[PDB]
Amino acid sequence: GYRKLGRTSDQRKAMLRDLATSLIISERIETTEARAKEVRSVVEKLITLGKKGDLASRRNAAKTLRNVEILNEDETTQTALQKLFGEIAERYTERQGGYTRILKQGPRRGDGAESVIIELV
Amino acid sequence: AVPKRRTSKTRKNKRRTHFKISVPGMTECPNCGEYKLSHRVCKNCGSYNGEEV
Amino acid sequence: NHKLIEAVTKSQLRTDLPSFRPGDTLRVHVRIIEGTRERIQVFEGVVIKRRGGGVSETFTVRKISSGVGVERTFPLHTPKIEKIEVKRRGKVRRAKLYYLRSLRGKAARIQEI
Amino acid sequence: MIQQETRLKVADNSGAREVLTIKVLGGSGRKTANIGDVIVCTVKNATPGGVVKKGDVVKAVIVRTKSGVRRNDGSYIKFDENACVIIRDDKGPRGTRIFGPVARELREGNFMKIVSLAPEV
Amino acid sequence: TKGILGRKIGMTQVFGENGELIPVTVVEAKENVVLQKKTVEVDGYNAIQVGFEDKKAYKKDAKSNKYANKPAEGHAKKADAAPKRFIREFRNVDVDAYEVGQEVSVDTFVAGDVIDVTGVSKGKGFQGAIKRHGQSRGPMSHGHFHRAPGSVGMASDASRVFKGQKMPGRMGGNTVTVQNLEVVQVDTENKVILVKGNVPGPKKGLVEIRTSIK
RNA sequence: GGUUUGGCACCUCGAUGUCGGCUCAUCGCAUCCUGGGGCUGUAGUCGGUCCCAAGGGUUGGGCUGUUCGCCCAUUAAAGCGGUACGCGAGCUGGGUUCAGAACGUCGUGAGACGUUCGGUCCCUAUCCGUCGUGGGCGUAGGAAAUUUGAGAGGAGCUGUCCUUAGUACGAGAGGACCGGGAUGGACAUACCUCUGGUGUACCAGUUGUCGUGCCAACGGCAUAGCUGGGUAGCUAUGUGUGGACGGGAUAAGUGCUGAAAGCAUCUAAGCAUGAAGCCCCCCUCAAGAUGAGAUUUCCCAACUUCGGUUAUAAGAUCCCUCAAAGAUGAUGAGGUUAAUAGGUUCGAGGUGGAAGCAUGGUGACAUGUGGAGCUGACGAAUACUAAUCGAUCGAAGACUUAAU
């Protein structure tokens, strides 16, 4: 219980795992305000497992990320666990906290939702 | 439960004194030179100017 | 804790006591006032509950007295406990043992180490 | 916490067994009692060969309980069985022996015979 | 005879010397200054006025209530103190206090065992006819009257609701006092009173610890 | 007197739809308890009657649809009545009064008046009323705090035990008044340190079956899959507090002096005393109290003939980061002169020995590296991330008369 979202305590656990593993890939996503005042509390507890680089932590981070596959390493595969411990966990090895930021776009049309852009700093 | 009387035109217009919308709270985006809603980015060319976004 | 509650409650935090964990069979000496003297009465049993919380931590020790089981909970820093000494050490896989409040006589045994 | 129609063992050889509760003696509107108060029991089960027969309004004192009492030092006590002792018209127990550890609270100068018969107190 | 102001910290327990066990409340009392002295010479009653937990001085772009503004700084200039945040006022005292700002000592309640603690309340906000007034509720198996108030009035010989019925609304926040609490242990170098028993407020609250009247 | 059974047929048949108990009240005095007296065929404990007295209190069950009622265990006491025989746009539908069926009985007959088994209880609150909580303007300049209390709410109950005293009074048995102390019952309010409850982004064991290519490790789904513990918060059965003692005027009554009425006489003139009741004392709201109070403190000019303006000052606010506050608005802690949230590094609490490797064994599993690892809400620390740049509202102090 950090903050509920209208999801039924079972969907909210598997919704943040759909925003985290699509933020280490695209490096920025466009979403609503309250879906991105909580995913800054997940992906900053997950680059911390990137700065360790253990065997326990390569397993203990895999239970909050999906298994997707990335193609353009000039035609070389890169699983989203391997994009961390890698080009993500080496960009921030001397910044102690504060990996994300939230940029408010505007209210979206026809729903009135305060859209924001989260992006890795 | 139903109304007992037909509510008049004096009592109707009084009840929507407080039924209105408020001004947006705009600023002047100092690089492009437009209006934008404050603490938000510009929809045109425009920086955040504490962040240059 | 708050570092102002903690700085006032360090004279009332009496430390001369041994260390233990649940699954151990202690031997308490209390100091009752019931009588012409002010006598010291023992109590012997196995420990169930915690030893943490701060200056308010309490343990819990039970025994099978004469058919009917009894329990006693003591504040750990009382002036009424004379001393505490240990009989035997167990292996219980738990932190609080409430399952001995229904087991009879040879199912309420705990092995040694 | 005893009530208005709970059952209790009897812990002596007064010719009785499980007795009910009728009413809790004290003030008016009183709804609970604990160790060392009088009640009005009625015998719902009896040992054949006793001096109290089944269906007979007798008093008692609550001697043990599963709730317990809190003392002056903050020490608690918890038995694992409810029990009482049938008491005569003046304060002294009807039976002869008492088959259990009575509570340490029980006497005040008043029940100076029930604590003089227990195996331990 | 007078009192101090205090910010609630928490609750733990001490032991008595005889073997007892006192649950107690930690109430700290930092810098308290007598800010004026209202007398019957000028218009009114007889009283003094204390302050508590001073603020910062002044700033040009003073944005919020951290810094002291211009009207509440000249008031704390005649009594040559720092600008205090929580200002309250105590009657039925002596004139032992100077009108100029001297500090009110925490060492004046060393055995005074008549204490009224005047907090606010915790302010629950959870409304409702049962939980506010402690009313009963109907049967949750046979009938229907699960949690509700009942008759709000008698019938058509009255044909009104009497002023002062019991209906839902915002519960909690009303100032209450508790009477005849005692003091366990005063302190220096922490400025902490240990007042026996609970006090009416949330943590980081504000209490007013004055000597009882009964 | 207007509660019972009635008498009259005035209001409602284009609806006034009927008994008891739950929920929540509120009023009367013709008083059941407690407070103060007067007689007594009142020795003392208990009682009986009658007068002043409405401040609070007035139990838990069996049998009946029950109204009455009868009984059982208590208790200081288990008061009688009005409010549409209080309350069904708050609940119940057992009952009374629907269609089915059966008995007894009456009827030649269809059917009928005492019992019996079953039998749909509808509605989104416009106005007055009530409980909360915000805008506007007013209090002769504009603002930040602190308060007097006109009036109005809240509270009000009382048991038992020891001592004065086995004294007073009594043939005995029995056994006090007025006082002085301790300790509980029910009710009200506050709080989470203690015993306990919940704790659905916390920790651990375990069944089924798909997935991560496989062994090892883990994710999904089965009420949260089930089971054992559980921090903050929110709570009671838990822990603290309360009704204290006074003061002024009175009722029934007991009085002192005293005439009408040479005496007598509580009264008509004058004076004392007297109750849980009345007005204050204690706790809370309160200057819209248009009779709109009071004390400290802050800001005070450039204009124009526009006789009065336009703006800024002191001060608040939209906007964003939030809670000790919360339906929303409000209150409160903050906005780079920055510790208000998030991360981070340290702990406290919670679980109870992580994975990998090393050793033991045929394997299940066990020991050691290690009070280990993981850890949502509570305590500290450091500007790394977001509270940016900015905007809108807001004074110039009227007149008359006695003082200076």
**What is the per-residue DSSP string for A98-116?**
--EEEEEEEEPTTT--EEE
The answer to whether A23 and A118 have CB atoms below 8 angstroms apart is yes
**Judging by DSSP bridges, how do beta strands D83-85 and D9-10 pair with one another?**
parallel
User: Which subunits have 3 or more CB–CB pairs within 8 Å of chain B?
Assistant: A
Evaluate whether chains D and E are touching (3 or more beta carbon pairs less than 8 Å apart): yes
Which residues 19-38 of chain B have a CB within 8 Å of chain A? 37
Beta strands in E71-206 (DSSP E): 90-91, 115-118, 177-181, 183-185, 192-196
The answer to whether A36 and A103 have CB atoms below 8 angstroms apart is no
Encoding tokens for residue C100? 């001995």
Q: Name the closest residue on chain E to residue D73, using Cα atoms.
A: E20
User: How many whole angstroms separate alpha carbon A25 and alpha carbon A73?
Assistant: 12
User: How many whole angstroms separate alpha carbon E210 and alpha carbon E197?
Assistant: 16
User: How many whole angstroms separate alpha carbon C68 and alpha carbon A120?
Assistant: 65
Nearest Cα neighbor of C78 from E13, E197, D105, D73 is: D73
- Taking CB atoms and an 8 Å cutoff, what residues of chain A touch B41? 103-105
Which residues 57-76 of chain D have a CB within 8 Å of chain E? 72-74
- Taking CB atoms and an 8 Å cutoff, what residues of chain E touch D73? 19-21
- Is strand F less than 7 A from the beta carbon of E170? yes
Experiment used for this model: cryo-EM
Chain E interface residues (partner C, CB cutoff 8 A): 9-10, 12-15, 19, 21, 26, 28, 185, 187, 190, 192, 194
Nearest Cα neighbor of C51 from C27, C81, C17 is: C17
Nearest Cα neighbor of E185 from E110, E112, E116 is: E110
User: How many whole angstroms separate alpha carbon D77 and alpha carbon C41?
Assistant: 15
For chain E, first and last CA: distance in Å? Answer: 13
One-letter amino acid identity for D8? L
User: How many whole angstroms separate alpha carbon C50 and alpha carbon C103?
Assistant: 21
Nearest Cα neighbor of E183 from E120, E116, E121 is: E116
On whether any CB of chain D is under 8 Å from the CB of C57, the answer is no
The answer to whether D113 and D95 have CB atoms below 8 angstroms apart is no
Which residues 46-85 of chain C have a CB within 8 Å of chain E? 54-56, 75, 77-80
Evaluate whether chains A and B are touching (3 or more beta carbon pairs less than 8 Å apart): yes
CA distances to A107, D70, E203 from E173, in Å: 37, 33, 14
Q: Measure, in angstroms, how far nucleotide F227 C1' is from residue E21 CA.
A: 38
One-letter amino acid identity for E54? D
Q: Under 8 Å CB-to-CB from E207, ≥6 apart: which residues?
A: E5, E6, E7, E8, E27, E117, E118, E119, E199, E200, E201
Test A106 with B43 for CB contact under 8 angstroms: yes
Nearest Cα neighbor of C59 from C40, C37, C74, C77 is: C74
User: How many whole angstroms separate alpha carbon B21 and alpha carbon E179?
Assistant: 51
Which nucleotide has the least CA–C1' distance to C49? F229
User: How many whole angstroms separate alpha carbon E189 and alpha carbon D99?
Assistant: 58
On whether any CB of chain C is under 8 Å from the CB of D78, the answer is yes
Q: Is C28 helix (H, G, I), strand (E, B) or coil?
A: strand
The answer to whether A99 and A47 have CB atoms below 8 angstroms apart is yes
The answer to whether E205 and E11 have CB atoms below 8 angstroms apart is no
On whether any CB of chain E is under 8 Å from the CB of C12, the answer is yes
Rg (CA), chain A: 15
Neighbour count for residue A91 (Cβ, 10 Å): 14
Test E19 with D74 for CB contact under 8 angstroms: no
Nearest Cα neighbor of E194 from E23, E33, E21 is: E23
Q: Is C113 helix (H, G, I), strand (E, B) or coil?
A: coil
Q: Is D63 helix (H, G, I), strand (E, B) or coil?
A: strand
Q: Is A16 helix (H, G, I), strand (E, B) or coil?
A: helix
- Is strand F less than 7 A from the beta carbon of E167? yes
Q: Measure, in angstroms, how far nucleotide F393 C1' is from residue E71 CA.
A: 21
Encoding tokens for residue C95? 């932190």
Question: Phi, psi at residue C108, to the nearest 5°?
Answer: -100, 25
Encoding tokens for residue A62? 């895999």
Helix, strand, coil in percent for chain E, rounding step 5: 5, 25, 65
User: How many whole angstroms separate alpha carbon C83 and alpha carbon B20?
Assistant: 76
Q: Counting one residue from A and one from B, how many pairs have CB atoms under 8 Å apart?
A: 13
- Longest Cα–Cα distance of chain C, Å, equals 49
User: How many whole angstroms separate alpha carbon A47 and alpha carbon A97?
Assistant: 9
D96 burial (CB, 10 Å; 0-12 / 13-18 / 19+) is: exposed
- Taking CB atoms and an 8 Å cutoff, what residues of chain E touch D74? 21
Long-range interactions of E55-62: CB distance < 8 A, separation 24+? E55/E82, E55/E83, E55/E84, E55/E85, E56/E83, E57/E82, E57/E83
Question: Phi, psi at residue A39, to the nearest 5°?
Answer: -75, -15
CA distances to C30, C73, D71 from C84, in Å: 9, 14, 20
- Longest Cα–Cα distance of chain B, Å, equals 62
Nearest Cα neighbor of D83 from D36, D25, D24, D26 is: D36
